[PDB]
Design a protein around this ligand. Structure first.
Ligand SMILES: *[C@@H]1O[C@H](CO)[C@@H](O)[C@H](O)[C@H]1NC(C)=O
Lengths: 36, 49
C-alpha cells in the first residue's frame, strides 16, 4: 500500500515536444470533405 | 471582529406567513444536441419513408 520502491530513483521533469498530438473530433457532429 | 459564521438556517414554522413558507424548487436543466437524447416523451414513432 504505502510501501516505497527501493531501487526507484527520481528524475528531473524533462520535456518532450509533440507533433499532431491533441487533435480530435470535437463532438458527435460529423463533417466530411470540408474544412471547419 | 471581521469573523462571521456563514452557515445559517431558514426558520420554518407552519404558522408563518407566505413569505416564510418554504418552497421546494427543482431547477430543470438540459443539454441541446450535445449527445443522443435518451429522454423523450411517449410519442409513438412512425415508419420511415
Ligand atoms: C515513502 O517514503 C516517504 C518519505 O519517508 C514517505 O513520505 C512516503 O509516505 C512513503 N511512501 C511512499 C510510497 O511514498
Amino acid at each position: 500500500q504505502c510501501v516505497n520502491l527501493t531501487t526507484r530513483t527520481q528524475l528531473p521533469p524533462a520535456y518532450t515536444n509533440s507533433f499532431t498530438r491533441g487533435v480530435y473530433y470535437p463532438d458527435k457532429v460529423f463533417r466530411s470533405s470540408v474544412l471547419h | 471582529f471581521n469573523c462571521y459564521f456563514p452557515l445559517q438556517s431558514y426558520g420554518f414554522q407552519p404558522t408563518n406567513g407566505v413569505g416564510y413558507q418554504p418552497y421546494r424548487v427543482v431547477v430543470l436543466s438540459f443539454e441541446l444536441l450535445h449527445a443522443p437524447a435518451t429522454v423523450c416523451g411517449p410519442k409513438k414513432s412512425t415508419n420511415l419513408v
